[PDB]
Symmetry: C5
Subunit: 154 residues, 5 copies
C-alpha cells in the first residue's frame, strides 16, 4: 500500500487560533499550551493569529471566517464548556463541534477541534495542562500534522 | 502571536432582536435586560429592532430573515424553553439552536444564542435576572463584541 | 426600540396543512382543532388545503412541496408520535422536526411545528383537546401570526 | 377545507427497494413482506427493483442513487439495526434515518423509512411479521400512498 | 422483482483508506485487517492508498478529499474512539459518522464507516481481530461490495 502522512515540522506554517473567553481560566492555558507547542515545532510566533470570541457557540463563526481568508494552513479552535444545571451545555457543545467540523469542510482548510467539554472544573484542569496533558498542545500538533498532510491533497 | 478582539463599545451599532412569546414571563425580562445592556453600552435605542415570534422553533426563521436584510451588525435571539412531560422540549431546543447557528453561518452576520433552556421555572428565573445574572444582558454584550470583531473579517 | 409583530387576523390568508394518518385517533382532533381555530380567526375554509401522509416521517416531504408551490402564507404540520418499545420514536421525531424546520428555511414560508410527541396515549389526548388544550389550535394561531409577521420581511 | 390524499392502488407504480444484508434473518422477511404487499396492491413484480447493501449505513447511499434515476415513484428502505454493547447502534441508526430522509428531500421522490431499530432480536422478530405486524408491509403500503399523493404535487 | 447487487471480486478496484492515529494500538490492527482482506479479494496492494490523520474527527476531512480526487472506487475509514470521562467521545463519534456519511453523499463515491466506538479497551480489542472479528476486514469487504454495486449506478 501507499502511505500518505503529515510530519510534525511547523516551519513555514501559518496558523490561526480561535479561543473562547468563556471559562478563560482554562482556555487561556489551552491557548498558551498551543502557542508554545507551535513555536517549539518551528512555527514563527508572528505567523500565528489569535481571535477571541465570547463563547464556544461563537467559535465556529470565527473559525470559518478566518479559514476563508485562505491566509492559514490550519486553524485551531480552543474552548472549554463545563456542564451546568441545564441542557444548555448540550447545545453549545453540539453546535460548536458541528460548526467547527463544517468550517473545515466548506473551507478546505483543516480546522482542529480543541474544545474541552467536561462535567466539572476538575476534568477541565485535568485536560488543560495536568494529568491528561494539555489539549491545546495536542491540538497544535494536530494542526501542524493536518497542514502538512493537506499539501498532499491538491 | 497577533490578537484579534472585539471591544464592548456599542456606539453606532445596529442590533436586531428576536424574542419568543412562549414563556414571556421570562423572555420579556430577557429582552429588557438586553435592551438596557445595549443602551448602557452606547447603542441607540432607535438602532434596535425587536421581532416577536410564537415560540423558539420560530426564532431561527425570524433571525435569518432579519440578518438577511443586512441591516444589522448582530442579532440577538431570546427565548425560554422549559422542559415538560414529553420530549417536545428536545426538538424545540435542538431546532432552535441548530437554526440560530446556521442563520449566522449562511448570513455572515453574528447571531447570538440567547435561548434559556431549563428543567423548571426556577432555573429560568435564575438566569433571567437573578442568581445567575440575566442571559439577555450577557447576550447583548456578546452581540456587541461579535459585531465589533466582525469588522476585522472583511 | 422598534417592535415587529404579527396580529391574529386570519382574513385573506391561505393556509396549507399536512397531517399524519398514524395515530389519527389523535391527529384528526388536532386537524379539526386547527380548522376551527383558523375559521374563527377569519380564514376562509376554501383557503385551507389539507394533505394526508402516512406518518410524521413523511410530513416534512409534503410540507416542503406544499410550501414550494408558494400558494400558501403559512403551513401547519400536524402529527402524533407516541413512544414505543424501540428507539424508532427518536428517529421519527427528530427527522420530522428536522425536516419541518428546514422546509420553512429553504422555502421562506413559515412552517408551524405541530407534531405532538408523547410517552403515552394519555399525554397525547392531553394535548389534543383536553387538559393541555389542543396543539392544533395553538398551531393554527401560530400559523396566522407567522404569516402576518412574514409580511414585514420582504 | 380541501383534502389531498393518496389511495392504495399500486397499479402502474414503479417501486425501488434498498435492503441491508446485515441482520438479513430479519430484513429478508421485511423484504418479502413488502413484495407481497406491493403485489397484492396492484404493483407488477417486474416494476420492482431491489438493491442490496451491506448495512443500514449504506442504505441512504443506495436509496439516493436509485431515486435520482427518476425511474421510481417511491423508494422503500428496509433494514434492521439491533442494539449491541457499544453506541455503534446510535450512529448507524441516526445516519441511516438522516440520509433516508434527505434522499427523498433532495430527490423529490418519496423515500419510505423502513428501518427496524430494536433493543433485541425479539423486538425485531416482533416487527418483521409477528405480534407487531411486518414493518415491510407497512412500508410498502406507505410507499404506494406517498407515490399517489406525490402526483398531486407537480 | 429485479435484483441489484455487488459481488466480492476486488480485482481492478482502487481503494482509499483513512486511518486515525489515535488509539493506533487498535486502528493499526484494523488497517492491516482491511489490507489483507482487500488483497485476498483480488485488490492489488499498489491500488491501495492509506492516509493517516490525528483522530477520528479528522477522518471525514481526509475521506472527502480523497474521494474527491475521483481516483478511488471506494473509501474505507478506520478509527477507534473509546469513551472516556467526558462527553468528548460523543462529539468525536457523531462528527466522524456525520462527516463520513456526507463525504460519500457529496462525493458519489462509497465511503465505508469503519470507526469502532467502544466503552472500553476490551470491546475495542474485541472488534479489532478477536471475539467479534475485525471491523477492518468487514469494512474492506463492504468497500468492495459498494464499489461493485456502484457500477450499477451511472
Ligand atoms: O465556550 C463556552 N461557551 C459557553 N457559552 C455558550 C455560548 O458559547 C455563547 O457564549 C452565548 O451562548 C451566545 O452565543 C459556555 N457555557 O455557557 O457554559 C461554556 O462552558 N463554554
Ligand atoms: O420558545 C418556546 N417554544 C415552545 N413552543 C414550541 C415551538 O417554539 C413553537 O411555538 C410551535 O411548536 C410551532 O412550531 C415551548 N414549548 O412548547 O414548551 C417553550 O418552552 N419555549
Ligand atoms: O406519525 C407517526 N408515524 C410513525 N411511523 C413512522 C413514520 O412516520 C412512517 O410512517 C414510516 O416510518 C416509513 O416512512 C410512528 N411510529 O412509528 O410510532 C408514530 O408514532 N407517529
Ligand atoms: O443494517 C445494519 N447495519 C449494521 N452495520 C452498520 C453499517 O450499516 C455498515 O454495515 C458498515 O458500518 C460500514 O459502512 C448494523 N450493526 O452494525 O449492528 C445493524 O444492526 N444493522
Ligand atoms: O479517533 C479518535 N480521536 C480522538 N480525538 C478526537 C479528534 O478525533 C481529534 O484528534 C482532535 O479533537 C482535534 O480535531 C479520540 N479521543 O479524543 O478520545 C478517540 O478516542 N478516537
Amino acid at each position: 500500500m501507499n502511505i500518505i502522512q503529515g510530519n510534525l515540522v511547523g516551519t513555514g506554517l501559518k496558523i490561526g487560533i480561535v479561543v473562547g473567553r468563556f471559562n478563560d481560566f482554562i482556555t487561556s492555558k489551552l491557548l498558551s499550551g498551543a502557542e508554545d507547542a507551535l513555536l517549539r515545532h518551528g512555527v514563527d510566533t508572528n505567523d500565528i493569529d489569535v481571535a477571541w470570541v465570547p463563547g464556544a457557540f461563537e467559535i465556529p463563526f470565527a473559525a470559518k471566517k478566518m479559514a476563508e481568508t485562505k491566509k492559514y494552513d490550519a486553524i485551531i479552535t480552543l474552548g472549554t464548556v463545563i456542564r451546568g444545571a441545564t441542557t444548555h451545555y448540550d447545545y453549545v457543545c453540539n453546535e460548536a463541534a458541528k460548526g467547527i467540523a463544517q468550517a473545515a469542510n466548506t473551507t478546505g482548510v483543516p480546522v482542529i477541534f480543541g474544545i474541552v467539554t467536561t462535567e466539572n472544573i476538575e476534568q477541565a484542569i485535568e485536560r488543560a495542562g495536568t494529568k491528561a496533558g494539555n489539549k491545546g498542545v495536542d491540538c497544535a500538533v494536530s494542526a501542524i500534522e493536518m497542514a502538512n498532510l493537506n499539501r498532499s491533497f491538491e
